[PDB]
């Protein structure tokens, strides 16, 4: 079954089903078990596309659509539900950190040469 | 892993056949061929292949797992699979 002939450049080369080199029989006496090749038999145009190291076309126990549903369904929950917590965080019913010396602004980088209005507090 | 020997590794498997309550201890032979010399056919053999494999570590390839059927022709392969001259 030669490749479709429409401005494609493959011509004589035949359509090869998406069978990766990992998918082929690992128990066969392959001449080149590196990617499970043999001698003389035809080779896929995108052979290096689907080799054991690279992408693989092998059966999975459960349908690819299922991954798509869980992977989308799984990940979509947090950033949604984590968006909700962006409005609703958690903390302890404890007041702010009232601080001496105008709230560190003397020594918290802020320039004190300009009038550093002293924000002081008292034990309520 | 020791210098594993065929004599040691087969005496392991002759135990499995004598531990096969179906394969009577008197019915033990190094050439106990299961479907016609013993009667336990291919179906009554492939589970034993996994049984020895479960206790051997190696997984004999399926093309000869169903085929290597007489205890000596199996233990020939662990001799091949381990590739030890003893």
């Amino acid at each position: 079954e030669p490749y479709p002939d429409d401005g494609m450049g493959y011509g004589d080369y035949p359509k090869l089903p998406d069978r990766s080199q990992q998918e082929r029989d690992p128990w066969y006496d392959w001449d080149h078990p590196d990617l499970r090749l043999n001698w003389g038999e035809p080779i896929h145009w995108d052979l290096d596309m689907y080799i054991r190291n690279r992408v693989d076309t092998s059966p999975t126990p459960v349908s690819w659509n299922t991954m798509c549903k869980h992977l989308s369904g799984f990940v979509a929950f947090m950033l949604f539900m984590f968006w909700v917590g962006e409005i609703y965080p958690s903390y302890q019913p404890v007041g702010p950190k009232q601080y001496p010396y105008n709230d560190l602004y003397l020594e918290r980088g802020g320039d004190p040469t300009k009038e550093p209005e002293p924000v002081v507090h008292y034990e309520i | 892993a020791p210098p594993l020997t065929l004599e040691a590794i087969k005496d392991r498997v002759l135990y499995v056949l004598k531990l096969y309550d179906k394969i009577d201890p008197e019915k033990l032979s190094v050439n106990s061929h299961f479907m016609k010399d013993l009667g336990l056919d291919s179906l009554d053999q492939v589970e034993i292949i996994m049984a020895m494999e479960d206790e051997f570590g190696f997984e004999i390839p399926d093309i000869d797992a169903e085929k290597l059927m007489c205890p000596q022709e199996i233990v020939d392969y662990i001799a091949d699979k381990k590739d030890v001259y003893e």
């Binding site: 003397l106 020594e107 918290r108 980088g109 320039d111 | -």
Partner: protein, 173 residues
């Protein structure tokens, strides 16, 4: 101290006075005492070796100085003789100006680490003095590209110059 504090100011040395009210022998101090005796002293004598052998001959070097040339401002247009000097002079000043922000950077670098968390106020003058160095450095050199030139430096200097001169006239109101 081959350097000097006028170019390289460093904070004064203030050390505490430990009062070991505890009883356990302080291992840290003993590690120093063995360290100076076992490590410093032999290599020090080797260092004392390199002193007088360096002292038996001490050839001197002197500073390389250049007379200040007429600048491109007085360099005649399209002239090639006195353009050479003024272009040379400007590029040395370019290399000079990189090393002084480097020196302020090195002064900046030492100020933080040697002053700990107190550097937030201890480098306040050190932080401020860099900004005037950097901003004036940009006015000296900015958007000049790889093929910077004394003419192009003056073109930028002029470009800023009439803009503020016109702004000053506008500010007169």
């Amino acid at each position: 101290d081959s350097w000097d504090k006028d170019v390289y100011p460093e904070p004064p040395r203030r050390t505490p006075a430990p009062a070991p009210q505890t009883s356990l022998p302080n291992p840290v101090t003993y590690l120093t005492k063995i360290f100076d005796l076992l490590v410093d002293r032999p290599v020090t004598l080797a260092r004392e070796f390199i002193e007088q052998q360096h002292a038996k001959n001490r050839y001197y070097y002197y500073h390389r100085e250049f007379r200040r040339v007429p600048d491109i401002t007085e360099c005649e247009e399209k002239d090639i003789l006195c353009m050479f000097e003024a272009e040379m002079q400007w590029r040395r000043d370019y290399k000079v100006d990189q090393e002084i922000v480097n020196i302020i950077q090195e002064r900046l670098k030492a100020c933080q680490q040697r002053e700990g968390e107190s550097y937030r106020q201890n480098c306040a003058k050190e932080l401020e003095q860099f900004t005037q160095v950097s901003k004036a450095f940009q006015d000296r050199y900015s958007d000049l590209g790889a093929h910077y030139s004394a003419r192009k430096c003056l073109a930028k200097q002029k470009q800023r110059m009439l803009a503020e001169r016109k702004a000053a006239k506008e500010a007169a109101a």
